[PDB]
Write a protein that binds this ligand. Structure first.
Ligand SMILES: Nc1ncnc2c1ncn2[C@@H]1O[C@H](COP(=O)(O)OP(=O)(O)O)[C@@H](O)[C@H]1O
Lengths: 67, 88, 237, 222, 237, 247, 400, 238, 226
């Protein structure tokens, strides 16, 4: 079924302003045949937030809270 | 709630059903209807009414409207129709 | 339901349906109980009577001096199992002059009955067996279901409404090892009497007893032989 | 369902529940086991006078001390009776004595279901060391000791009547008349000697035909 | 009906049971590649090992049928092992009946005949496992053959079986159409790059198991981890 | 599981056997006519495609024994095995008794095997009916017709093919016992074959005929070759022309 | 929606000779003279009017208020003063009719008029002539009588007694307090069965008649095969108490089919609805259900029981005298011959039924009319035998 | 399936054998099992549901001894499981009679798996409703452990589980570090894993049948001494 | 049941389906010339991965009996193996008759284990047989249910109808020499889609000297100048 969206890549990519973001849980079992050129290709690493990201997101979470 | 059932007439149930049905018709209880009640094991109340129905039909067939003392004919028609219900 | 038609076919939900129906053959039968002791094994079978004129049929079948069985279910392929068990015990007697231990016999029965559960055109042996034996490890009681999965048991009952007898045996099974012969037989009689409706009660003509012990070879007691055990019934129907 | 071996979904395999209800199409037969002996009464039910009554026989002597009364498909009963005779003769030849009626009934029951099941019920009766005995064997390879048994199309009514007309200390003379009056009440026609067969069992006699048209001495009282 | 349920000819004039049995090979999630070369014949299949509690020592799909013939199986593993056992029995029986070793083509012919008997009749069913067997044959060079659940035994030079067998066959057709013989380096590298292009994991030298039969060195070498790693390093260079 | 049909009907009929017997009428055409000093069979060559070579020398007519010959009209797959079994039975009798097998006994054996095939087991009935012509010491020239039902019949002028009703009607109309001879029997056979085959002026290739004759203490079964058959055709044509023109 | 039909036809079927003679001539002249006199009577009564009284009080008050334009719609409900009428295209009006109101003929679900403008019902069309959903009373009280069939005296007496237990002497078992609607289960060879109809016309001489033949193995999810017949016998009780002749469906539709479950749902529904209706403890009415078949073996045990379905009657094959009588009846209309060749055609005959007798009689006339046309064709003496062979009895290859 | 899932000889339209796909469901439904290859041996363990206290001490035990050094821990339909255990015993006896010595575990597992595949191939017979581990040890070949599904084939297992909860057991099995832990602590740990798997959360009380094979027993696959492994069960309880 | 079966009223439905299957797609023409018989067939392998010298469509059953076939090659293998065993048994029983054409009719007749004992599922291959050990050639066809037909020229492929039409229009004839193989190749050409080559076309010839499967050299030689 992912290969179906793969061959959709000729869905007028020049004409169509459509992209597809794959928000998997773990990139472990992702059918490595789907990471070749012409496939989904790019992958960006997101993990549990570090201490800096954690304190920043705590700040923005506390933003609406005024006590 | 309270799911209950019966439809399992024993000797006492069958003979009481005989009594209430024999309340109808021109029959009386001098007949030994207990004998026929023993003869049909678990014959509902539906078949007892049928057997009383048949006894009436035999009396009219004999052209005698009497059935109070028509007990031997009562027993005869009841037993032969019990034979035919079991095997016809 | 298609998948319930044949023994060979397997239900999509799991276990097959013909064997599950085979256990209903033993459910639809006269009740029988069987309990172990420290030294004796006793079977109490309800001899189901057709009519008062006819006899109460035969239960608690005889196999050998130290082994006796009680059937509960399809009587046709039950004398066949009795013949098989008798033949195996006699074969053991003939080959090495010793009583065939009950566990090995039960394993043989299970293996023999397993094949019809897999061979097409062969119905499973829908017979419930309560084997009472006395091997060298004291008395033994085994239950064989048509599913060919036998069980060992301190006290087990099979038949119609046998669940009440099972519950009574379970509640009184703690005081089973230390019981005299008559005490254990009366335990079994009370267990079986609790099975039938309150209208029914134990009679010398409708009950059978199978006792096997260390010094007592398997014996089938009935009316005159049962009356000494039937005394002191403590009747609470 | 329809398979002769497949069990029913509820409790008990079919096609044997179908073979058992073949005594229904079969003809009525009654036997009484008394202390005097065993009385076996059947009805021939001749359909046309041209057929010889001697040809139609429901009671056949398996041996000198065993008599058998069939109720059902006489074709299958021929095979079962032949096997009973063969087994009795084999036992006598092996052990030089008279095979018990219980043992013969057990052998017939073993051979009953081993081929579609036989659809006949037999009423074995004979003398043994345990007095006169009677056994009711049924198409589904099951045998039961009985004292006064009825079988056939009207088994229910005949057995119900026998249940109250029988008593534990009767003789042959009362048993024959009770069986005959019952038979007359069961059948459609009368109990003429050409239509009713009777078999007697005695401790000191072989089981012979009931006097062969001189048995009217037992139907005139009826 | 039952045209598509039993091994009988369809009204349209086809045999649907074997047509299904071939898709059974695709079922199971595996692929295999066979490449005949100038002098050698090398075969490689992926080793799908879920979790390491399994023994990678014995999860293999390639076997030695005799001292010079090696097979790779594709499809259901039970039928695969049954056919491997049958092939080994046939090889031994041939060596017993006839002195010389069984030619690989004759062994494939016998296995295909067994499979054809299976698709004949109706009591049994075809085995859902396609076998690619290779071996060096004198006066013939390397030889590769494929026996299928039908009984059609053929296949040469470059032949593949499994889920993505069509893509591998297409790439190998491109390679063989490129007219250049493969030595005992190019044949292995061609097979490795074929299977890698089919399933791009770059093939860490632990997830494939390659079998090799050369001419100067007979026997079915199941190349070890070091050999496959060396070939992978040489190829990715 | 699938079970074959070798059973009765609610009325009590063996409709499988009946359907096979009716199907025998469909396809094939043979006829046997019995005359004094000679018995003959006529067969209709169904497929006359020019791409055959006719090297088997016989398709419908089969020589089964020294003193007899048959002609099938059913499915050729069963026809071949039935002819082989018939020859085997005849030769087994010859071995056992050192004497040619009487035709009736041979036909009874074959119909017994067909009755067994339709009687027991899950086996198809032999969808083939065949005639037999032969000579013996007891009854002389004999003709027999056996259907797949296994119920053979001793005939003297019969047909077994597609238009078997029309052929037997033509036989009944123009059959005369006693006066019948070999030559007049040939004339009648060719006439009835011309009647049952719509195309007039039947070619000698589309008709295969074999005559059994009694020579000096020896039975000769001669299949009439093309030239003799077409000479018979020419004589028949002369007779037709004379009869039509004389009116 | 249907109660009765105007029976002003079938003018004296008792033309005694049924053949051209002076007596039959004279009977027809009396018939025609009466028709002339009746027409003259009614015409003179309607023309020489009793009195001329205005516009018969019609055009003065009701006709004008009814108006010229009208439309028809069904009448749905009734209330004390108004009426609830479902007119065309799903319109619904609550109006009190007072002009030309006939409440008895109005009825729910009947066609009434609407005077437009001020839409008020002004009349009803009692004819309507569209009660066509389920029509089984169209053949009610068939004209066939006892005399049409002879030689079946024992069966005629038996069925007559079984159906003249009601009507005649109902107080007999009213005092015996049973009221059994047992019906009659009829046997008979397959060569008969429309006589199971002919012997039914004996009872059809009284009250009406309903027929359910072939019906279906009620695959319908609602079932309602026997249940709708139950409604129709209720309609029969509303009418003169009719009988229900279910020949061939008491056999197939109620088969002693010996499988239990997964069996076309008729065994679940049809048999269980049949015994509910056949039990007098559930439904009243003098309706007598005649269950006739040609397969006694397939009698279901519920149908077997005389306790609910009594009065089992067997129809045998005709005897020599019965064959003589039926042949006489069928050839009486055609004047077979002047030699009266009667017994030669039946003396050696066996297993010949009523349908065969009718067929051979018809074919004898057909063969005579073919070319042997000679009024009472002298050939009929043997041609009756020629077409009594007619082959066509049974044919099944050889098997012998 | 519907139409194609009636006999094992009928292939699916996609090419599958639904009879075995359903026979696996019986194994999935029956009570679980576990077997771990310790450093110098193989340790089994199976919880058995005491369906009623009427039964005696642990009977119809899921553990079996198929040969002197080989043991079988089975789950699924127990009667067919016992018949297959008898088949394995006969196979081991035949191999010992023919080739002498003791049957290697890989070959025994292969032969019994081929027999099971023979039973799933045909139509008249039905696939076996059981899955079992065969565990053995010898000085020459170390410790081996092969698991056979109701239709599949033997596979080498460092540690395996089958029955009601395969994944739940396997997670903690892979959490456990085998290949360096002696069979004693492995006996403690297999009971720990079984008690971690649900026993009475939805079911009755369970009995702990544990088995041994290893150099500590010089081969000779035997049931662990239950009196001294009750303390191991206690450690599992904690 | 376990034989050639499924024959309804006036039909052989299973056999008819087998004949629908043997329609196949391999033309496999056969021509009976005066000097001998030619059995030519088309080997159109899928892609170039397969080999042509590995498997063969023409099989010499014995010294001068050659065999070609139609659809269902796996069945054809078992059938030709059975035919080889049957011919060998006949030659062993009747020792040293050099039995080919006095055996070609006999081997065709013994092709009754071919179909008259079908084996639950009937064979799905129709096969042409050639023999020339009688001073005269023989071409026979055995079909999935029938028997010997004794053809002079026929085809058994996807376009066997127009192939047979081509054979008769091109006048298979009777005076044609052994080199009617040119006409056989032409008949294949009609039922062929491609530039047929030596490995693409396999042909065997059976003349009075014996039977021989023509090697790709001679096949290409004949295909040249066509
Ligand atoms: N005994 C008879 N006397 C007069 N008419 C009869 C007799 N029997 C049948 N018929 C007439 O012949 C017709 C066919 O009768 P029947 O045999 O009942 O038909 P079927 O055989 O089609 O059921 C009936 O409609 C009936 O009117």
């Amino acid at each position: 079924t992912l290969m179906e969206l793969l061959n959709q890549m000729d869905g007028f990519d020049t004409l169509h302003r459509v992209k597809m973001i794959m928000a998997t849980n773990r990139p472990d079992t992702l059918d490595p045949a789907l990471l070749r050129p012409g496939r989904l290709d790019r992958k960006i690493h997101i993990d549990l937030p570090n201490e800096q990201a954690r304190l920043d997101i705590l700040k923005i979470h506390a933003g609406p809270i005024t006590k | 709630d309270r799911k209950i059932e019966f439809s399992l007439p024993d000797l006492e149930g069958r003979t009481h059903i005989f009594k209430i049905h024999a309340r109808s018709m021109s029959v009386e209880r001098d007949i030994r209807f207990e004998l026929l009640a023993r003869l049909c094991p678990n014959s509902t109340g539906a078949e007892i009414r049928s057997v009383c129905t048949e006894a009436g039909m035999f009396a009219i067939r004999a052209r005698r409207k009497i059935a109070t003392e028509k007990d031997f004919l009562e027993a005869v028609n009841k037993v032969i129709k019990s034979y035919a219900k079991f095997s016809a | 339901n298609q998948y319930d038609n044949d023994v060979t076919v397997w239900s999509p939900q799991g276990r097959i349906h013909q064997i599950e129906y085979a256990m209903e053959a033993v459910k639809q039968g006269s009740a029988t109980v069987g309990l172990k002791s420290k030294t004796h094994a006793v079977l109490v079978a309800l001899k189901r009577a057709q009519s008062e004129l006819a006899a109460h049929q035969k239960k608690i079948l005889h196999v050998d001096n130290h082994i006796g069985i009680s059937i509960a279910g399809l009587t046709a392929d039950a004398r066949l199992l009795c013949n098989f068990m008798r033949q195996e015990c006699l074969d053991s007697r003939f080959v090495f002059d010793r009583p065939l231990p009950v566990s090995r016999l039960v394993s043989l029965i299970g293996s023999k009955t397993q094949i019809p559960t897999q061979r097409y055109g062969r119905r499973p042996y829908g017979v419930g067996l309560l084997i009472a034996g006395y091997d060298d490890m004291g008395p033994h009681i085994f239950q064989t279901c048509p599913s060919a999965n036998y069980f060992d048991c301190r006290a087990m009952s099979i038949g119609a409404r046998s669940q009440s007898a099972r519950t009574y045996l379970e509640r009184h099974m703690s005081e089973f090892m230390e019981c005299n012969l008559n005490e254990l037989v009366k335990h079994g009689l009370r267990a079986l009497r609790e099975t039938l409706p309150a209208e029914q009660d134990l009679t010398t003509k409708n009950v059978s007893i199978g006792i096997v012990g260390k010094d007592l070879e398997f014996t089938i007691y009935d009316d005159d032989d049962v009356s000494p055990f039937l005394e002191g019934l403590e009747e609470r129907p | 369902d329809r398979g002769v071996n497949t069990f029913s979904p509820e409790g008990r395999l079919f096609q044997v529940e179908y073979a058992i209800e073949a005594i229904k199409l079969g003809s009525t037969a009654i036997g009484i086991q008394t202390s005097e002996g065993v009385c076996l009464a059947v009805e021939k039910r001749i359909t046309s006078p041209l057929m010889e009554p001697s040809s139609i026989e429901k009671i056949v002597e398996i041996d000198a001390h065993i008599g058998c009364a069939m109720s059902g498909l006489i074709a299958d009963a021929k095979t079962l009776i032949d096997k009973a005779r063969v087994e009795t003769q084999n036992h006598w030849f092996t052990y030089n004595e008279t095979m018990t009626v219980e043992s013969v009934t057990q052998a017939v029951s073993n051979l009953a279901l081993q081929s579609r099941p036989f659809g006949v019920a037999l009423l074995f009766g004979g003398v043994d060391e345990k007095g006169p005995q009677l056994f009711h064997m049924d198409p589904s390879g099951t045998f039961v000791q009985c004292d006064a048994r009825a079988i056939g199309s009207a088994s229910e009514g005949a057995q119900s009547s026998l249940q109250e007309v029988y008593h534990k200390s009767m003789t042959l003379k009362e048993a024959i008349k009770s069986s005959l009056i019952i038979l007359k009440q069961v059948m459609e026609e009368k109990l003429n000697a050409t239509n009713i067969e009777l078999a007697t069992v005695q401790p000191g006699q072989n089981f012979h035909m009931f006097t062969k048209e001189e048995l009217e001495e037992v139907i005139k009282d009826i | 009906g039952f045209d598509r349920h039993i091994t009988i000819f369809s009204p349209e004039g086809r045999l649907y049971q074997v047509e299904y049995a071939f898709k059974a090979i695709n079922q199971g999630g595996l692929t295999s590649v066979a490449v005949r070369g100038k002098d050698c014949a090398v075969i490689v299949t992926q080793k799908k090992v879920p979790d390491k509690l399994l023994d990678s020592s014995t999860v293999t799909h390639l076997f030695k049928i005799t001292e010079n013939i090696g097979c790779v199986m594709t499809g259901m593993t039970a039928d695969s092992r049954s056919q491997v056992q049958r092939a080994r029995y046939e090889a031994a029986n041939w060596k017993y009946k006839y002195g010389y070793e069984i030619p690989v083509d004759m062994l494939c012919k016998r296995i295909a005949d067994i499979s054809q008997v299976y698709t004949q009749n109706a009591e049994m069913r075809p085995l859902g496992c396609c076998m690619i067997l290779i071996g060096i044959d004198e006066e013939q060079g390397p030889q590769v053959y494929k026996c299928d659940p039908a009984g059609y035994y053929c296949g040469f030079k470059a032949t593949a079986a499994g889920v993505k067998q069509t893509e591998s066959t297409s790439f190998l057709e491109k390679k063989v159409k490129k007219k250049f013989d493969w030595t005992f380096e190019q044949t292995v590298e061609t097979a490795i790059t074929c299977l890698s292009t089919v399933l791009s994991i770059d093939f860490k030298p632990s997830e494939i198991e390659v079998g090799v039969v050369t001419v100067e060195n007979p026997k079915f070498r199941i190349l070890t981890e070091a050999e496959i790693d060396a070939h992978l390093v040489a190829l990715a260079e | 599981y699938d079970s074959r049909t070798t059973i009765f009907s609610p009325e009590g009929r063996l409709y499988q056997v009946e359907y096979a017997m009716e199907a025998i009428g469909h396809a094939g055409t043979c006829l046997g006519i019995l005359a004094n000093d000679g018995v003959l069979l006529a067969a209709e060559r169904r497929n006359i495609h020019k791409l055959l070579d006719e090297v088997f020398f016989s398709e419908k007519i089969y020589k089964l024994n020294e003193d007899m010959a048959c002609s099938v009209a059913g499915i050729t797959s069963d026809a071949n095995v039935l002819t082989n079994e018939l020859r085997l039975i005849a030769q087994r009798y010859l071995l056992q008794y050192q004497e040619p097998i009487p035709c009736e006994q041979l036909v009874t054996a074959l119909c017994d095997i067909k009755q067994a095939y339709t009687q027991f087991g899950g086996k198809r009935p032999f969808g083939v009916s065949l005639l037999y012509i032969g000579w013996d010491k007891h009854y002389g020239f004999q003709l027999y017709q056996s259907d797949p039902s296994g119920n053979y019949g001793g005939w003297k002028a019969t047909c077994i093919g597609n238009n078997s009703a029309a052929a037997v009607s033509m036989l009944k109309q123009d059959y005369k016992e006693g006066e019948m001879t070999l030559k007049s029997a040939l004339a009648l056979a060719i006439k009835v074959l011309n009647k049952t085959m719509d195309v007039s002026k039947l070619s000698a290739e589309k008709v295969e005929i074999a005559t059994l004759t009694r020579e000096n203490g020896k039975t000769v079964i001669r299949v009439l070759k093309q030239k003799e058959v077409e000479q018979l055709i020419k004589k028949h044509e002369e007779e037709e022309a004379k009869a039509e023109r004389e009116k | 929606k249907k109660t009765k039909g105007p029976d002003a036809a079938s003018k004296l079927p008792l033309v005694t000779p049924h053949t051209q003679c002076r007596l039959k001539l004279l009977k027809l002249e009396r018939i025609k003279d009466y028709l002339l006199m009746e027409e003259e009577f009614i015409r003179n009564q309607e023309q020489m009017k009793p009195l001329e009284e205005k516009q018969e009080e019609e055009r003065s008050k009701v006709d004008d208020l009814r108006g010229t334009p009208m439309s028809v719609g069904t009448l749905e409900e009734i209330i004390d003063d108004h009426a609830i009428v479902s007119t065309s295209v799903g319109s619904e009006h609550y109006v009190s009719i007072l002009s030309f109101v006939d409440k008895d003929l109005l009825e729910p679900g009947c066609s009434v008029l609407l005077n437009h403008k001020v839409h008020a019902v002004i009349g009803v069309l009692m004819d309507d002539t569209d009660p066509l959903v389920t029509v089984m009373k169209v053949e009610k009280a068939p004209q066939e009588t006892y005399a049409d069939i002879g030689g079946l005296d024992n069966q005629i007496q038996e069925i007559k007694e079984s159906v003249e237990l009601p009507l005649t002497h109902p107080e007999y078992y009213e005092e015996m307090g049973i009221k059994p609607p047992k019906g009659v289960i009829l046997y008979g060879p397959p060569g008969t069965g429309k006589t199971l109809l002919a012997k039914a016309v004996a009872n059809q001489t009284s009250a009406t008649f309903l027929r359910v033949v072939g019906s279906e193995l009620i695959q319908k999810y609602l079932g309602d095969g026997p249940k709708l017949v139950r409604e129709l016998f209720r309609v029969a009780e509303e009418h003169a108490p009719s009988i229900v002749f279910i020949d061939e469906i008491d056999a197939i539709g109620t088969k002693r089919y010996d499988s239990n479950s997964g069996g076309e749902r008729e065994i679940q529904r049809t048999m269980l609805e049949l015994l509910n209706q056949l039990d007098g403890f559930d439904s009243r009415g003098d309706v007598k259900v005649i269950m006739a078949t040609n397969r006694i073996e397939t009698l279901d045990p519920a149908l077997i029981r005389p306790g609910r379905i009594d009065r089992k009657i067997e129809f045998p094959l005709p005897d020599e005298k019965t064959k003589k009588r039926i042949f006489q009846i069928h050839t009486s209309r055609m004047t077979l011959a002047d030699d009266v060749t009667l017994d030669d055609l039946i003396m050696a005959k066996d297993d010949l039924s009523g349908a065969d007798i009718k067929a051979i009689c018809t074919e004898a006339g057909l063969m005579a009319l073919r070319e042997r046309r000679m009024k009472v064709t002298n050939e009929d003496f043997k041609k009756s035998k020629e077409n009594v062979l007619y082959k066509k009895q049974e044919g099944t290859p050889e098997g012998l | 399936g519907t139409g194609y899932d009636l006999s094992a000889s009928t292939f699916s339209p996609d090419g599958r054998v639904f009879q075995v796909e359903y026979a696996m469901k019986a194994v999935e439904n029956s009570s679980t099992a576990i077997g771990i290859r310790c450093k110098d041996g193989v340790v089994f363990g199976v919880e058995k549901l005491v369906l009623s206290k009427l039964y005696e001490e642990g009977s119809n035990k899921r553990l079996f001894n198929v040969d002197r050094h080989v043991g079988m821990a089975v789950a699924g339909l127990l009667a067919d499981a016992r018949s297959l255990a008898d088949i394995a015993r006969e196979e081991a006896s035949n191999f010992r009679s023919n080739f002498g010595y003791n049957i290697p575990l890989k070959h025994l597992a292969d032969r019994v798996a081929m027999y099971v595949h023979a039973y799933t191939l045909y139509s008249a017979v039905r696939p076996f409703g059981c899955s079992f581990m065969l565990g053995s040890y010898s000085v020459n070949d170390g410790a081996q452990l092969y698991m056979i599904d109701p239709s599949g084939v033997s596979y080498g297992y460092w540690g395996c589980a089958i029955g009601k909860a395969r994944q739940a057991a396997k997670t903690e099995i892979e959490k456990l570090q085998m290949k360096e832990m002696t069979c004693r602590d492995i006996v403690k740990e297999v009971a720990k894993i079984i008690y971690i798997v649900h026993d009475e959360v939805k079911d009755k009380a369970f009995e702990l049948e544990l088995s041994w094979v290893g150099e500590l027993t010089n081969g000779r696959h035997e049931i662990v001494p239950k009196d001294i492994r009750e303390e191991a069960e206690k450690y599992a309880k904690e | 049941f376990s034989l050639t079966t499924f024959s309804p009223s006036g039909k052989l439905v299973q056999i008819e389906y087998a004949l629908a299957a043997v329609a196949g797609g391999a033309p496999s023409v056969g021509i009976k010339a005066a000097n001998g018989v030619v059995l030519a067939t088309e080997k159109k392998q899928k892609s170039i991965l397969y080999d042509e010298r590995s498997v063969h469509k023409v099989e010499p059953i014995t010294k001068h009996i050659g065999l070609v076939y139609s659809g269902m090659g796996p069945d054809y293998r078992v059938l030709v193996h059975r035919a080889r065993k049957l011919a060998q048994q006949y030659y062993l029983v009747y020792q040293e008759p050099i039995p080919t054409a006095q055996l070609v009719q006999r081997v065709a007749s013994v092709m009754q284990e071919y179909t008259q004992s079908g084996g639950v599922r009937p064979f799905g291959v129709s096969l042409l047989i050639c023999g020339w050990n009688e001073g005269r050639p023989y071409l026979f066809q055995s079909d999935p249910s029938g028997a010997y037909f004794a053809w002079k020229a026929t085809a058994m492929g996807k376009n066997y109808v127009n192939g047979k039409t081509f054979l008769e229009k091109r006048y298979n004839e009777d005076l044609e020499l052994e080199d009617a193989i040119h006409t056989a190749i032409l008949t294949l050409k009609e039922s062929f889609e491609g530039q047929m080559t030596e490995d693409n076309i396999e042909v065997g010839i059976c003349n009075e000297a014996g039977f021989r499967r023509l090697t790709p050299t001679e096949v290409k030689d004949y295909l040249a100048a066509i």
